[PDB]
Chain A
Amino acid sequence: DIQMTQSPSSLSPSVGDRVTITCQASQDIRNHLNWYQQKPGKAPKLLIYDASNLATGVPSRFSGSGSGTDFTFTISSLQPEDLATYYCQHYDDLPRITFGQGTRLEIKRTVAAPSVFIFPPSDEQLKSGTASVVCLLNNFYPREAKVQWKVDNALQSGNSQESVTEQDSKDSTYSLSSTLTLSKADYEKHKVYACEVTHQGLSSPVTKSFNRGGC
């Protein structure tokens, strides 16, 4: 009371594509709908107010439609910076305010091989008795990727963590960072530390590694 349902939950348009989003209201709500754009880590941004009005300074590619229960939001041709989650909001003067669930965007773009970098633990970190090795994958698409930690090129381990960045606003790429963490005790037992990256934009898996240390 009142119920808002947004469709769809996600889309995978290409740069230059028209994208349309839908909100339905359970009961008649005349023109009381606003649309927002939320980039990750940012606050929402008003795009459309009162169903069909462009908020000032908002680019001309954005538009909205609808009257009673059926409403439509449209980006005439998607630009890379338009990557965001999009929300409708019903308002009532009583007041009652209701946001839709949101539509996430995943921009489709051309396959790109990651740049792979590797970082041995810092001398400062070792003093405290723990070792962190970081394998960096930069600017790649699609998001799917496998990181293989080989220690002494003999055994794949099972004691690391990774996170994927949000899709990039300028070039639509992803980045991953995996961290191998062992301790000073286990780090100085073994010699070679390798990160094997298995992406789609690579013919054969790429490997990046170093050797050390002493004490």
Chain B
Amino acid sequence: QLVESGAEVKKPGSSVKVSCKTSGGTFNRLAMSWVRQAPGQGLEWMGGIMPIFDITNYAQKFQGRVTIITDESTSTAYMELRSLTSEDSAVYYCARASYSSSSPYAFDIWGQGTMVTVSSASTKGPSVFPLAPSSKSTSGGTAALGCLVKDYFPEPVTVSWNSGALTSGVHTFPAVLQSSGLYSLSSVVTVPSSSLGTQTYICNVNHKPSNTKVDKKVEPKSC
């Protein structure tokens, strides 16, 4: 079962290391690979490992910049890419090979992906403003409420509601590139207008690249 490290910013000449933790614990019984997705565009296999035979494979285009490592003691796998180019901005995935396939390349278990941006520009923390209801946010009798995540670099941010306990009827919009160079994003949710007095709504914004975590309670307008 696979879990990856948080999104990162890296300076052009840098190298990035991405980790991938398995729940099982032993690499000596599996094959796994690293695949990236650079919009734009499409999926690219970077390399693979069969640690039991001490086999490590690297794609020709990445040979000389890529290292794949396993650590039995932490049951964590690592890929490191060096000499980062503006062409290496991508989401990186570790994935496990299915045992059903005649080769170790039918990837059936995947990590959540790690976004790496190659910039040179400094990280910026997001500011989180409520989107309060509102006369004026109804249909009804349903109310729309939300959070505005403004002024952050680079992507991405995560938004959840009530620490995961609210999943029904959320829309988290794609970011837009402001003329500043910073990103803006909004996340809105539809609720009963009936229960606005008794229920509590908190958006949870997480910006891993600058290590920011903001919890914002949304409530009607005050005067």
Contacts and interface: CB of A to CB of B under 8 A. Distances in A.
A–B contact via C-beta, under 8 angstroms: yes
Contact of B93 (A43, A125, A164): A43
Nearest to A91: B105
Contact of A97 (B101, B105, B150): B105
Residue of A93, A98, A115 contacting most chain B CB atoms (<10 Å): A115
Contacts of A56: 100
A163 B129 contact: no
Interface string B148-172: 1010000000000000000000010
Given A44-B107, A177-B188, A87 B178 contact: no
Nearest to B172: A165
Given A87-B43, A101-B42, A138 B134 contact: no
Nearest to A125: B129
Interface string A43-58: 1111001100101100
Interface stretch (B7-15, B82-90, B109-117): B109-117
A43 B110 contact: yes
B143 to A, nearest CB: 9
A95 B106 CA distance: 13
B102 interface: yes
B132 A122 contact: yes
Nearest to A102: B42
Nearest to A132: B148
Interface string A120-149: 111111001000101010100000000000
B48 interface: yes
A50 B186 contact: no
Number of contact residues on B: which range applies?
Answer: 35 or more
B144 interface: yes
B96 to A, nearest CB: 10
Contacts of A89: 43, 105
A122 B216 CA distance: 13
Interface in A75-119: 87, 89, 91-93, 95, 97-99, 101-102, 115, 117-119
B195 to A, nearest CB: 18
Given A32-B103, A138-B190, A95 B139 contact: no
B176 A161 contact: yes
A32 B101 CA distance: 9
Contacts of A67: none
Interface of A: 31-32, 34, 36, 43-46, 49-50, 53, 55-56, 87, 89, 91-93, 95, 97-99, 101-102, 115, 117-125, 128, 132, 134, 136, 138, 161-166, 175, 177, 179, 210
Across the A-B interface, the 4 shortest Cβ-Cβ residue pairs? A97-B45, A43-B110, A91-B105, A49-B106
